[PDB]
């Protein structure tokens, strides 16, 4: 449920509440190790905005590149 | 298939379609309350004396479109698939003629092209909400109905034969 | 001295009612209104001279507005003489010039009757019974332009809010006016002060308005029947009664509620005014309306009934005693029906989050009540499925 | 699922559940109605500008509220109210999205103009709700109506619920999922359960919008009104006789018309015996005393049930006095009815007049004239018109006889005219 919300947010085309939370969220899926939690946060953004705006995030110079597995 | 002819046009010959009915219409239900003979609803003591149907495009501001209600004993899924199958042909129509999608609009806009792919982002959203699929399945949707309009073997000048040909399309 | 200005009024009346239209078409107001306007019209006691006196007042202050906007209103009886067709029609000057005034006057004391015979108040002036607090009011809320305000015209509509019947009256004079003036003296504190501390602000607001100076002379009996009274009417203007007993049973209550509230007032029991009265409602408004439901649900809970509210629950055991011994009857159909429409006021009553601070007695009221619906529910369930 | 035969009331709930949701506003935009109709009440005559004239900070910013409130509901549902609505409304008005800059007219309902808007939004709501309930009645097989009018409606008998926080919690907890052995697992919906929780209202109400009305004089009102409560009659001839020799002034006429105007407005509002007499009536039940010296004696015979005759030959009276002696009986009407005939109108309006009796003709006319043109439509058409509409005993002769060459913008003079032949023969 909480990497729901973090793709519902990041789905948005963020005052000082959204912006922690992802932060966290961030920290939560660097610190944890697994990729189980990135692949679901992908087939989530993927099931809310098709999978060309996840490959433009695969894209360098992105601010949302960890959502993506290692 | 025949049915497709009125999309045809709106997608080619769109001029010819100014003056039609689209399946994009609330079609007022009226053709409890009464009116005096001047004009006045009363169900006299105000005034003491004891269609409506617009044609062309009639939705509004893209934004505001929120819930897909029918009226005209339709799913809201068909009924939305329609409404989309008549934005694209619109659409076309516009590149093709612009003009003529701007007086089919009501109210007239500036841009057609941009209102309409509006208006399709939104059927597409209401879409996977009422359906659950993701957003590439729903677009896969639209190709599945589009692939089985093309397989099976007017002008809608009439707000009549527009629900008949609605009824058809959605069977 | 230069005119018989209560032989003019009095001369007035019947074209002034003639102007006069009620919403619930009270046919048989128009009479009764210009008998009583004809019998105070005088000077027997002071209180029809006082009554004289306050409309010549209003009237004076009406026709100095009216006459602020034109030219040389001291120029009114020339341009009665420029004037040939009222010369006609009245024959002599005199005439002409007794008609001109009525005509000033009639629509001014028409609009003054349609403001002080709302809901029949007018009766409260003549009754003979009627306590003397009610007349000192009346007149002081007639006397009082700033708080009975009365915008000018420049037909008529009476706006009897409650629902009185032939010749009943509003217990409390103008209790519409005092409502809506406590009404805006509520919001005004809500706006200015916090959430805690607006019941002490509303009060002290109220005792420093001259209507509260007033009221706060009435001491002993009066103020209580003043209370009850204002209670009553305040129900009639909130919420739609049936019976009488109804409003009975819904003025005890809001009574109890108030004095709950002014028990927890940071303050001795010393009188209780009329902006506690409001503030009971607006605690207990949920309450009050649940009882009103249930009340039109189930009629016969009244005539099954027989510090702190309570009446709320009573009536809810009373319901569930009733569908008990009612069980099944007239027919399952009808039973179940009751039973369901009756769910959502007991599960309000029969439930913590709209009960608070409630007494013991209260409490053991609401859990049997609790151990009767859950039987009555299983019942009702097992009849509208099996 | 075909749920509309399994489950109607939530079929029913969800096709119009954006539009039910805002039902829960009904209470505060006519508790707003009401107020303003009391406030506005008795009086002819922006948003922001209402607002500005409230230096009150508590009663501004709830007023505020109330509109924002009132604006929103309109304008989420403007469009619907331009099409699936029973109140007909122009175009013009549910096309734009409304603001504090609006006009203070929507917000003041009425059945005509921009106040129609309010009305219409109420109604709708209304619709809304009842509907729904029939529905439930349809399920509930028992006519048990709650009826509730709009003259008392709380937040209790009105639709009132939330996606986020009620609804939406009641459909996650029928999402009863299922699984087989080695097959995946299955989502469904006990539609049953969700309609009996949702069924869960049980409650009624009926329009009786507040408004006031655009008036606030049209004698034929008071005309009908009093012949709905009462039953009225035709002067006799002798009381006709009577009247016009006693009457020889103009002003005892208009006092006696005074008198006929005041017993007529107080029947109108309650009405009373027909045969009673007038002098009667008027001393003891309206305590007309101290001014009805000299009318009695004309009132002697007149009964309540004559008022609206005599006022009507008074009236008259009074013009064909104003006509014995040159002057203008008509100075209240447009000077374009004052037009004079040509030689071949005035023959056939000779011709007619022989043909036609003088007195009903030219009191009929006269009360025609000063109830309604008070000069290009027929004075055939609307003559019969107005005949008809009060159920008039139409003659043979002015039917069948009247000259159509004869237009309205003479009619005055036409009428003149017959009073002169009537003035010449008497
Ligand atoms: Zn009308």
Redesign the interface.
Known sequence: LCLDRAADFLSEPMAKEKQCYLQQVKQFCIRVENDWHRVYLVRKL??????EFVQGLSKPGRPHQWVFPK | NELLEPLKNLAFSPATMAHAFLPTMPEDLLAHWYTCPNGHPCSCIDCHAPDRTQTGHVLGNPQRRDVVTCDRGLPPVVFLLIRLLTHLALLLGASQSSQALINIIKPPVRDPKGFLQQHILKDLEQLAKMLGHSADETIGVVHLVLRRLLQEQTELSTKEMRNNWEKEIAA | SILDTTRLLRSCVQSAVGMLRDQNESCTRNMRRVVLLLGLLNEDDACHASFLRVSKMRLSVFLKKQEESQFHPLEWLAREACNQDALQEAGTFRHTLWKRVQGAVTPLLASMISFIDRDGNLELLTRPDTPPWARDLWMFIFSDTMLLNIPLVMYIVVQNHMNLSENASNNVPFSWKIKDYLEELWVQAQYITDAEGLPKKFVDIFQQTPLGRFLAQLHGEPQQELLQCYLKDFILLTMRVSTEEELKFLQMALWSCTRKLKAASEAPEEEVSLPWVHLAYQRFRSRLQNFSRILTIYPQVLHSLMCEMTLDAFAAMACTEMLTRNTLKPSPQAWLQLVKNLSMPLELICSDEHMQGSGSLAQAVIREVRAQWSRIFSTALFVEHV | KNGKERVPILWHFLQKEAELRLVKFLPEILALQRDLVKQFQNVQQSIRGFLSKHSSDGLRQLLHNRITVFLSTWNKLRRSLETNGEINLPKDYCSTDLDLDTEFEILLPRRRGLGLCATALVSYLIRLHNEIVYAVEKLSKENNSYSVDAAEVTELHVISYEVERDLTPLILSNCQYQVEEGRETVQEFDLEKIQRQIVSRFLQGKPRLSLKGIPTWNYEHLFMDIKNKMAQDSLPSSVISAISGQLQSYSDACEVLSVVEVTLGFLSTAGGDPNMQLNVYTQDILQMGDQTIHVLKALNRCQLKHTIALWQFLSAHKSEQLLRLHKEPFGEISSRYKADLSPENAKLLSTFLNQTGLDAFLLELHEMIILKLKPQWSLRDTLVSYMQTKESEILPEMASQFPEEILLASCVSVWKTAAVLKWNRE
């Not at chain 1, 993927?46 to 999978?51: D, I, K, L, N, V």
């Open positions: 993927s099931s809310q905005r098709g999978m």
